[PDB]
Amino acid sequence: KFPRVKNWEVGSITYDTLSAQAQQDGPCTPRRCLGSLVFPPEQLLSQARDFINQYYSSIKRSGSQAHEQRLQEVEAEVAATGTYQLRESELVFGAKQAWRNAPRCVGRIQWGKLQVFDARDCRSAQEMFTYICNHIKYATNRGNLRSAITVFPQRCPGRGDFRIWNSQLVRYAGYRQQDGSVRGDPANVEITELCIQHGWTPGNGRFDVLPLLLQAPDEPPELFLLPPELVLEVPLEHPTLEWFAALGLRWYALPAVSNMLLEIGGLEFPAAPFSGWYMSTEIGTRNLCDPHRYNILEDVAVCMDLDTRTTSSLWKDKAAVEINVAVLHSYQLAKVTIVDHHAATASFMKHLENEQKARGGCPADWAWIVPPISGSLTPVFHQEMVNYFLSPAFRYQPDPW
Amino acid sequence: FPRVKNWEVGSITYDTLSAQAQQDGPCTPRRCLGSLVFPRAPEQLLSQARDFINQYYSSIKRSGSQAHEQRLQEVEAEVAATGTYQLRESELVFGAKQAWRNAPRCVGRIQWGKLQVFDARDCRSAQEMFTYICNHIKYATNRGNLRSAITVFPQRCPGRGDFRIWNSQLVRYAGYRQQDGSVRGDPANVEITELCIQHGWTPGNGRFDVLPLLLQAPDEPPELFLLPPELVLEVPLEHPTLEWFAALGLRWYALPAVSNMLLEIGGLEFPAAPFSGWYMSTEIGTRNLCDPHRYNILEDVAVCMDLDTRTTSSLWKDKAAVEINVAVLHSYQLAKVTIVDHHAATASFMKHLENEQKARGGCPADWAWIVPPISGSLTPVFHQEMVNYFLSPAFRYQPDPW
Numbered sequence: 065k066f067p068r069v070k071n072w073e074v075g076s077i078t079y080d081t082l083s084a085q086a087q088q089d090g091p092c093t094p095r096r097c098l099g100s101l102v103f104p105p106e107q108l109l110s111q112a113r114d115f116i117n118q119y120y121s122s123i124k125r126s127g128s129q130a131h132e133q134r135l136q137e138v139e140a141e142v143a144a145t146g147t148y149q150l151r152e153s154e155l156v157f158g159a160k161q162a163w164r165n166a167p168r169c170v171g172r173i174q175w176g177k178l179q180v181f182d183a184r185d186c187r188s189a190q191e192m193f194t195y196i197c198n199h200i201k202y203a204t205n206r207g208n209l210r211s212a213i214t215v216f217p218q219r220c221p222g223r224g225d226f227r228i229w230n231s232q233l234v235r236y237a238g239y240r241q242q243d244g245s246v247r248g249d250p251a252n253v254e255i256t257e258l259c260i261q262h263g264w265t266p267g268n269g270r271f272d273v274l275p276l277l278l279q280a281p282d283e284p285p286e287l288f289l290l291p292p293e294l295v296l297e298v299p300l301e302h303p304t305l306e307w308f309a310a311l312g313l314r315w316y317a318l319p320a321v322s323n324m325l326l327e328i329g330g331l332e333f334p335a336a337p338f339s340g341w342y343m344s345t346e347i348g349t350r351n352l353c354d355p356h357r358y359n360i361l362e363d364v365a366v367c368m369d370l371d372t373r374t375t376s377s378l379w380k381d382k383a384a385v386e387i388n389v390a391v392l393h394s395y396q397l398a399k400v401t402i403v404d405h406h407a408a409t410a411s412f413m414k415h416l417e418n419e420q421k422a423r424g425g426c427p428a429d430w431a432w433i434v435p436p437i438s439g440s441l442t443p444v445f446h447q448e449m450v451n452y453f454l455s456p457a458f459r460y461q462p463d464p465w
Numbered sequence: 466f467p468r469v470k471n472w473e474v475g476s477i478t479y480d481t482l483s484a485q486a487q488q489d490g491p492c493t494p495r496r497c498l499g500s501l502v503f504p505r506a507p508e509q510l511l512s513q514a515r516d517f518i519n520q521y522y523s524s525i526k527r528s529g530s531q532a533h534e535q536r537l538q539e540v541e542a543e544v545a546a547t548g549t550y551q552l553r554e555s556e557l558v559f560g561a562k563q564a565w566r567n568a569p570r571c572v573g574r575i576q577w578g579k580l581q582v583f584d585a586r587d588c589r590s591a592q593e594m595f596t597y598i599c600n601h602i603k604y605a606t607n608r609g610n611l612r613s614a615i616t617v618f619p620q621r622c623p624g625r626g627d628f629r630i631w632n633s634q635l636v637r638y639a640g641y642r643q644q645d646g647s648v649r650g651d652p653a654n655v656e657i658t659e660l661c662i663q664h665g666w667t668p669g670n671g672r673f674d675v676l677p678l679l680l681q682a683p684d685e686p687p688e689l690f691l692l693p694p695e696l697v698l699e700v701p702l703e704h705p706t707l708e709w710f711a712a713l714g715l716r717w718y719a720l721p722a723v724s725n726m727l728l729e730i731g732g733l734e735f736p737a738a739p740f741s742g743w744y745m746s747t748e749i750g751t752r753n754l755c756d757p758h759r760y761n762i763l764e765d766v767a768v769c770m771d772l773d774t775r776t777t778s779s780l781w782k783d784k785a786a787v788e789i790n791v792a793v794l795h796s797y798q799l800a801k802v803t804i805v806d807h808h809a810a811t812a813s814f815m816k817h818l819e820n821e822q823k824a825r826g827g828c829p830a831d832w833a834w835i836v837p838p839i840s841g842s843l844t845p846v847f848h849q850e851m852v853n854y855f856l857s858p859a860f861r862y863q864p865d866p867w
């Protein structure tokens with residue numbers, strides 16, 4: 065079958081033929097849908113073959129010339145050595161494809177413009193740090209943010225793995241107390257205690273940038289203090305609520321995911337940090353207002369003199385909107401690239417139209433594409449979507465312990 | 466069995482109930498189609514009947530008792546001699562409540578045990594059907610102190626056509642296709658509007674014209690019935706602090722009464738069984754008034770509010786929508802018509818999930834429909850993983866009769 069997909073705002077119908085290529089199976093069955101869940105050897109040749117075929121199709125060079133050629137070297141490389149190395153442009157093409165294939169990413173209209181830094185020859189934690197440091201300064205670019213990914217060595221058997229122990233390159237500390245509850249970011253309480261365990265004297269702040277626990281193969285991690293002028297941060301203020309700045313809230317410029325695993329042609333890169341620029345709801349709605357994160361919503365509503373005594377005043381909704389307004393205002397005044405959820409979702413709709421004519425569909429995870437505020441005010445809410453796994457891909461992986 | 470996390474609290478449970486999922490949904494291990502709005506003989510009738518009777522005798526703490534085996538026997542005998550069977554009244558009441566309890570897209574299910582069931586299985590004509598419907602509306606509306614209710618018309622049976630209510634709800638506003646191709650009124654109802662005109666209705670030309678009912682008796686064309694105005698309780702919309710808002714002339718109706726779904730109980734099908742609750746405010750304020758394919762008022766409200774509508778990063782859409790929902794809540798409270806906001810509704814749904822975990826080992830829930838269309842992650846259901854599956858008794862979609 066080819067799933068019929070409807071856009072209810074316009075009445076248009078498309079068929080997702082690309083879904084028929086679904087490689088890895090997801091968590092749903094005819095009996096029950098698990099779509100809402102956050103976390104659901106010489107067959108290596110099979111996935112290497114298919115990825116190489118993808119490469120030469122994308123350059124109008126299938127069934128000719130070096131296509132058959134490159135098929136044989138990987139045949140020989142694996143027959144001889146048991147794995148294989150990717151050609152330079154393949155690593156590039158595979159990095160962009162895995163972004164293109166990320167079902168939960170609303171920012172994919174940008175997928176063709178990605179800076180791929182090849183770090184496959186890295187071989188120490190001090191080396192990672194300067195690779196990571198080049199990435200951060202390139203991507204930050206004085207606030208004119210540029211998408212980038214650094215690709216550390218591809219895992220091989222019988223020997224350890226490169227891993228960044230932090231979930232992101234920039235994280236804020238979270239400290240327990242004489243009463244349990246957390247000062248700082250609660251999402252990072254764990255890595256905060258691992259950084260304390262391995263040295264790092266704890267600060268006493270709600271926005272202390274954590275160090276970096278970087279791990280070379282078969283070696284215990286090594287702490288690396290991040291250069292303060294390399295971590296671009298934005299103090300948060302509101303255009304008309306003058307007291308908002310006095311709340312002392314801040315967030316960082318660069319969203320750099322450093323705990324996911326990049327998988328290209330059967331190869332596995334457990335260290336491949338990728339970075340883009342923020343959508344404002346990630347900071348304003350999820351990071352600052354989630355009950356298990358900074359959870360500032362009631363505090364902002366107190367300052368706004370809102371009626372927190374009744375849910376039907378919609379005090380939560382009014383304060384959340386103003387927090388998002390402050391995020392967008394602050395980043396724009398700081399000249400730091402950011403995108404609001406209306407602009408982001410409109411571009412994703414254009415991306416769906418592109419991917420329809422280009423590939424016959426697009427894997428999209430509705431629950432992650434629709435923003436966490438104002439869902440039905442964005443066009444993606446009214447768009448039916450089909451979720452499935454394509455390769456190359458970014459995958460979650462276990463914490464390195 | 467699927468493990469299910471609540472990310473706000475860190476809680477973990479397992480949905481053992483999903484293992485009992487009767488019919489099949491649209492998802493496969495290849496591909497999830499969870500976001501799709503429409504995702505869809507004697508021995509098999511016997512099998513659903515047997516399961517339902519088991520459910521009924523379980524709920525009354527009489528599993529495997531004498532009465533239980535007798536009822537099983539009575540149903541098989543009736544299916545063999547007539548091809549179908551008849552529900553006892555208490556079984557119908559249980560089946561209607563279970564169907565609501567099993568509805569995965571309903572956030573209002575904390576209320577599932579408080580459902581007034583009107584037995585209209587003796588209905589013989591469209592005229593009698595209209596009288597039943599008017600009494601349903603009257604009872605459920607209750608001068609604004611709304612009460613949940615369902616009216617069950619005769620089941621589908623071999624030899625005769627179905628009872629059908631052609632209208633998707635008992636209260637709908639007309640949608641008039643216009644001179645240029647626009648729509649005056651509710652664009653969701655253009656089709657049923659054209660049908661009513663074609664069946665003799667003299668149309669109005671307002672934006673909030675209540676439609677007549679088109680009621681179909683077995684093997685009869687549909688018959689048009691006008692609802693008496695004093696039966697349709699409506700709420701003029703005003704804003705507590707934006708006084709120009711009343712001059713928009715917006716209104717909405719008190720009673721959400723779904724009238725085009727099929728009730729399935731133990732293999733028997735009731736193609737006409739309208740049911741009604743009370744509104745959650747986002748349904749009116751966000752979906753019905755602000756959807757671009759509905760009344761689509763968001764831009765005009767934002768212009769009146771003097772928001773900057775030429776850049777998206779001012780969040781003019783979010784600000785106008787919030788005040789439209791404030792206006793709905795204020796107006797319904799002022800008129801003393803039951804309404805629940807999305808925060809209270811989702812909080813009570815969380816309690817429903819916990820009740821159902823202890824009672825049945827889980828709860829079928831459709832995350833994309835449970836999470837409200839504004840301020841999603843501000844409600845607790847956003848951070849709750851959910852498992853979507855089909856249990857019976859059930860409310861199902863059915864094709865339009867025309």
Ligand code: HEM
Nearest residue numbers: 163166168169170171174211212338339340341342343458
């Ligand atoms: C350039 C601007 C970008 C924007 C505005 C953007 C936006 C987003 C957002 C809002 C999410 C949802 C985050 C969540 O899980 O709550 C997301 C997820 C994701 N993005 Fe993007 N993104 C961008 C660039 C990129 C790049 C450069 C890559 C990789 C090369 C990427 C790959 C992914 C992946 C793999 C996920 C899934 C994360 C997860 O499952 O937790 N994105 N993106």
Ligand code: HEM
Nearest residue numbers: 565568570571572573576613614740741742743744745860
């Ligand atoms: C009493 C207060 C109630 C509230 C607050 C409530 C709330 C809701 C909401 C917000 C929806 C989603 C509607 C949409 O966006 O299309 C819904 C769907 C639904 N409700 Fe409830 N409801 C209530 C009563 C009832 C009753 C009494 C029944 C049946 C006896 C019921 C059965 C259903 C069903 C079957 C659906 C799914 C309809 C569909 O698939 O489109 N609800 N409910």
Ligand SMILES: COc1cc(N)nc(CCc2cc(CCN(C)C)cc(F)c2F)c1
Nearest residue numbers: 319320321338339340341342343346350351
């Ligand atoms: C690399 O470029 C990007 C640009 C933007 N704006 N966002 C991302 C996703 C960032 C991201 C954030 C989170 C935590 C946040 N919620 C789960 C509460 C988990 C991820 F797994 C992830 F990936 C990436």
Ligand SMILES: COc1cc(N)nc(CCc2cc(CCN(C)C)cc(F)c2F)c1
Nearest residue numbers: 573721722723740741742743744745748752
């Ligand atoms: C019976 O009691 C109820 C109480 C409340 N508040 N809401 C409902 C749902 C009413 C309902 C509405 C819609 C159309 C709107 N969408 C497309 C956004 C479809 C349904 F299938 C349905 F059922 C029922």
Ligand SMILES: C[C@H](O)[C@H](O)[C@H]1CNc2nc(N)[nH]c(=O)c2N1
Nearest residue numbers: 100101102431432847848849850
């Ligand atoms: C329980 C639920 O699946 C979970 O909260 C998901 C829902 N949608 C999301 N969407 C985004 N963008 N980010 C998230 O973390 C989540 N969380």
Ligand SMILES: C[C@H](O)[C@H](O)[C@H]1CNc2nc(N)[nH]c(=O)c2N1
Nearest residue numbers: 445446447448500501502833834
């Ligand atoms: C395409 C998408 O699934 C569709 O617009 C859904 C999303 N969630 C919804 N949720 C509710 N309550 N009602 C709806 O109509 C919808 N529409």
Ligand SMILES: [Cl-]
Nearest residue numbers: 319346347351
């Ligand atoms: Cl983040």
Ligand SMILES: [Cl-]
Nearest residue numbers: 721748749753
């Ligand atoms: Cl409605």
Ligand SMILES: [Gd]
Nearest residue numbers: 366367368369
């Ligand atoms: Gd004050």
Ligand SMILES: [Gd]
Nearest residue numbers: 705706707708
């Ligand atoms: Gd005023």
Ligand SMILES: [Gd]
Nearest residue numbers: 712713765769
């Ligand atoms: Gd006007």
Ligand SMILES: [Zn+2]
Nearest residue numbers: 092097492497
């Ligand atoms: Zn699914």
